[PDB]
Amino acid sequence: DIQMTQSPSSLSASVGDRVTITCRASQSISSYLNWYQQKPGKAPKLLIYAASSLQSGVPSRFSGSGSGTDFTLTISSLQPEDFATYYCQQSYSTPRTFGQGTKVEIKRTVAAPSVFIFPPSDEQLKSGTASVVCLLNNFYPREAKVQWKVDNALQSGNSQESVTEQDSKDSTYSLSSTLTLSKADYEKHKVYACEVTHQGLSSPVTKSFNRGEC
Amino acid sequence: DLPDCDIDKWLNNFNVPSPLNWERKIFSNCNFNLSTLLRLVHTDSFSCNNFDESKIYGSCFKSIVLDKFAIPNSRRSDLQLGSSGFLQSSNYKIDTTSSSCQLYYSLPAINVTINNYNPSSWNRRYGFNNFNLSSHSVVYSRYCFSVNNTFCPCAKPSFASSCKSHKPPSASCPIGTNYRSCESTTVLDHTDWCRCSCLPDPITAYDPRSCSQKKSLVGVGEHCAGFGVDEEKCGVLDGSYNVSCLCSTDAFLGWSYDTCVSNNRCNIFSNFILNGINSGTTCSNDLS
Amino acid sequence: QVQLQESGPGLVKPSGTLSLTCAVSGGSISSSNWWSWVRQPPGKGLEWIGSMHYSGSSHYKPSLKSRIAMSVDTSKNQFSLNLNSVTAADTAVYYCAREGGSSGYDYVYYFDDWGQGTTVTVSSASTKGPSVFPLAPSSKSGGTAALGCLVKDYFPEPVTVSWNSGALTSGVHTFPAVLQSSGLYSLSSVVTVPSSSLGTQTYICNVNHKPSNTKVDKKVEP
Ligand SMILES: *[C@@H]1O[C@H](CO)[C@@H](O)[C@H](O)[C@H]1NC(C)=O
Ligand SMILES: *[C@@H]1O[C@H](CO)[C@@H](O)[C@H](O)[C@H]1NC(C)=O
């Protein structure tokens, strides 16, 4: 097999920067080299084929060069929608082989999260479980801490969280944290709170509700 | 007491090769007049690259090397210096590093006979026959393929006889050559679907590294290494070791032809390579 | 204008057979294109597994040769994948793609017109559709409120969520699912809207879980 090795494996750049990604084949493959872009939750998309041919409809800020073993993908002026993993791929031989991928992260200014807390629905309660959701919306950088509190008891378990990938328009992240209790446990406590620490906030922020209030 | 180079006599020879079998002649130790040469051949254009044309007059050279061939009408623009078209990719590369001149001329069509010949010994070994074309048809290659001296395009009869589906044609390969590589594959409604190399064909080969026919641009001073062959058209179905491996006429791919004739004259090209200016005895008498 | 669409069951039992089909529109399967399958294990890169031409010629990932077979159906303009004796090593998103050649001398093959992919999970566990719960906007905030849907307790991946049948896309974040200790997935989808519109605008999340044949709309009200 022809091994494809990309450099770097990840990088961080600002909007308007020139981004350069290289790829090396373990043996000569002439110009039988293609580049793909894969955005979060989407299938790969062809950018460059035959080492330097730009696919129709792809912006001209993308370009490829090279022949033999060493190839280069260039993004002349990085845009937010270019957040993606990029892959090289050879078609000189079988099996077809891909490079390992290069993640392009977008550096931007700090943005504080907007924080929201959601009580369980009456519908879920009827099923015997209560999920409480804390949402941290549109923040940067990724590092954030969510601390759940139930009548000021600091939770260490009973929660799971998920984070989106950088937004294709504003390059921010969002985070969803779910605290899960039994309905029996949920109805024994009054104040449900999530406390958020993030470098964009002037102070750690707490969103809370009192069970039943309205 | 040195003889005339007689360059015009060679350029005006009525047996004119095509780009595929371009003819070189080396001139030396002789006298020539460029002025007379450009008159005695019906010159359309003479110009030089990496060289001052006006400096040929009155100069001596170690040798002067001419490479000539008729021009297929549709491919004349392929002869622009640096062109990636068919003529220079796959028939005759005009060397841009030498001191050279390019001559475009013509001969009355009624006398010209195009000599077409496939220079590839491996093509001819596996059955490529003389061309059977009109006397002003000019053959050119579109793709050239090189092979090792062990090349044979036919699947092995004993392998083919094991194929239940998609049996390749087969034949004995010459002593000292290797049979075409083949594998039994599984497809969703066949368990012995044999798949050999260079498919669908060498020009569109899915796996170029596994195809023994290697795409080969002509280098300086080279002839086309050979037309690619569709290996599915070499040998015969159920062919045994008593059949010699040959490829049918339609197996040879990636070549074309066009007439050289316009306004009742056949258009011809010759390259000139000027070797060793200010030395030797290939001398212009234009100033004498 | 070539468009591809994968189809086939997302859940396969261990040692069972994975069977996928790819339907081709906008172009003929009987052409110089080859047709390809490329898979992507969770958190991993791309791995080609096979390609086939309508003549029947094919190439497969060699480590899969004893388990894999493809077909090209010229009468239905479809091609298919069969992978026998699957294990958790075969859990992945499987993409179909067109593999065509460039117009240069080299005739370079490349992948194009990729399908959206189908998520395959190799598991003995049974399919389970989700419950869909509203994440209600706050009685309140500033000019922006958040609302959403909690898509709870389903198996296997994936689910799709839209808002107002696709008319609402701006400000939507659908999060990666988390695997709960029960072995079921749970996912949230949220959207930020003008708080001034909470009394006047209707917000419905549309949830589809194909493995369980679940289709749910949920109105999210303050
Ligand atoms: C070249 O031209 C000169 C001047 O007319 C003449 O003396 C000489 O013989 C010519 N040489 C040829 C025709 O080879
Ligand atoms: C052709 O010969 C070269 C050495 O000149 C060798 O490396 C190569 O593998 C040969 N190819 C085949 C198909 O035998």
CSV table of C-alpha atoms in Angstrom, one decimal, chain B residues 11 31-32 35 50 52-53 68 78 80 105 131 135 141 154 158 194 202 208 223 248 265 285:
chain,number,residue,atom,x,y,z
B,11,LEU,CA,13.7,17.6,-47.4
B,31,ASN,CA,28.6,23.3,-47.7
B,32,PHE,CA,25.1,24.8,-47.8
B,35,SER,CA,19.2,31.4,-48.7
B,50,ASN,CA,17.8,29.8,-28.5
B,52,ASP,CA,19.9,34.2,-33.7
B,53,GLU,CA,18.7,33.1,-37.2
B,68,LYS,CA,11.4,15.8,-40.5
B,78,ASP,CA,0.8,21.0,-31.6
B,80,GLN,CA,4.3,25.5,-31.1
B,105,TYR,CA,7.3,23.7,-45.8
B,131,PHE,CA,-1.0,0.6,-41.7
B,135,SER,CA,-1.4,7.8,-49.3
B,141,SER,CA,0.1,8.8,-31.5
B,154,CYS,CA,-2.1,-12.3,-22.9
B,158,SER,CA,-4.3,-22.5,-17.5
B,194,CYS,CA,-11.7,-13.2,-13.3
B,202,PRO,CA,-4.4,1.1,-20.3
B,208,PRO,CA,-2.0,2.3,-13.3
B,223,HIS,CA,10.0,7.8,-30.8
B,248,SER,CA,-6.3,-7.9,-32.7
B,265,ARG,CA,0.2,20.4,-51.2
B,285,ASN,CA,28.5,29.7,-48.2
